[PDB]
Amino acid sequence: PVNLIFCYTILQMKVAERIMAQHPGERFYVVLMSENRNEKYDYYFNQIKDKAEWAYFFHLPYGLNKSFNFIPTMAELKVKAMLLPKVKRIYLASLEKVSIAAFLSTYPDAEIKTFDDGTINLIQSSSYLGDEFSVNGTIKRNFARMMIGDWSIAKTRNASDEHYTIFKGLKNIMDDGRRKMTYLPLFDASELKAGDETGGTVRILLGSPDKEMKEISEKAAKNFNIQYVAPHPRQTYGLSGVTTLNSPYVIEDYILREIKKNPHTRYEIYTFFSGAALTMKDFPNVHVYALKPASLPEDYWLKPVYALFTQSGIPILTFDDKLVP
């Protein structure tokens, strides 16, 4: 159980030091956020790093703060005035209307538009009311409590008149009557020239970011005879006995390039319920499979995941990982 202190000036750091020296028995994490860095600043930051359990110094880009901790002069007013950019419109993920809400309000006349955060846009309001979410003090209740509140503010607090979704035909949480829904497809399957699938089958497993799916994954690769793993961008460890595909592209892009180059090849994409299955279903010559490992709990994925997948036409294969050496 910790205390936080936030600073943005040297004198505020001296205050942080007085506050800590007054609570010798307490734990402190201390964040300095400042546009300036120099000998003077560091010296007082490092004084705080020596007393705090943890300390971080965000070195922000010049002119992000349009207010002042001091009383400004006509000079200091004019400079900030004429560097403050002139802002007509702002685009952001729906949930960023919550977390970058304080910046939004400093541009009250900017027209706002949002786009999907990701697959989290696809869980509809009522789903967060399910029994799955309604036990108490549980980790699933706290999540639902949170999203319900966050979506509320994203929908009701800084009027934005349009929402971009990348998912064709699945109801969006932001489709609330208060805004235009626009479909914006990220991926161009035309000009690919994909024909009949002769000359072979390439099998790829999508990697999981959970370091704990390493052994399930390796078994999946063996069971279904998959040669390649496409690692998750949030993924950090490796699989043994499976050729990892190293590439700067995300999977969808990489697969689009391969189809262009290999227009007769059957592509099989296996995934533990990654969002990619949803963006990829309709790709020509691509066949997507959800893998549901029997050894994980049933509640390891939220009920809405299963619904979304079968609603989207993706096979959910039961996989008996425990029967694989």
Added chain:
Amino acid sequence: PVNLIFCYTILQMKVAERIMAQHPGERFYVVLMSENRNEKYDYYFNQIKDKAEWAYFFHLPYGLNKSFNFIPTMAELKVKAMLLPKVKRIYLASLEKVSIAAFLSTYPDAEIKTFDDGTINLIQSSSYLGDEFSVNGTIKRNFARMMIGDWSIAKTRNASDEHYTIFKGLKNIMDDGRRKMTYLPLFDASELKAGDETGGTVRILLGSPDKEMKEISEKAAKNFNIQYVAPHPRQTYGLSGVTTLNSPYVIEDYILREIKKNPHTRYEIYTFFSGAALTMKDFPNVHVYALKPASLPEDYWLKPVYALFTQSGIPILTFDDKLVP
């Protein structure tokens, strides 16, 4: 006149690219804010940096985001759950209740306490109603409009039950009946052992951060025969013909050390109305002077500055800079 786009995932960056490619004639600044960095992320960031008029990639500290752009698994819920720190209390500058407001609300049961931003705490509510601030479309009106709103939310939106001020005897903007005011003195003048001022006078000019006070400053140093300049921490250029004092300390600290070491020396501190004069007035053997250059406009400092200074007992000297070679 610009458009902003904010992202926190690769797919959101692809959306940013579609949005820009659809407004070829518009200017874009694009910010990616992400906890992960790698080949995959950079590649898509650099794609955006090639189309945007400007682009910046904040590489945030792990686990700052307690929500999800994807639908999380029981694993992904548990990990975030048990890394999310346990937070009892949060300390921050009064105005940071506005700018870090969205983080505050994600800790609804944390007890909150504030401290002064700086001298800006000393301008009282009504002062922002002055004629000085009440012409229209002016830069001074916009400032007052802004502070009035910011103070309102700092005072009324995330109940905090105590405010620390570093200024003894000057009314604080946060002294609104809704909270305890506590004086927290930053600076220990006792144990200094300052005696009668014999053995000489040391004169120091406080540097201005306005690169445009360079010539006024140099003249001040010459006029009043000041040998040393203490440069501002926000200050970035140098003075000619004045020995700059290089030190990691801020002025108050540095002066405290000097008095200990030189307990019979008279210290004269000259300043164009820096906040330091307010924290320093009562230091033993320190005599502070405000310098008001005749060649600047009268409205270069806000009326409340002058009031605060004379209210605080600091001499305001008229300085005829134009009469100095």
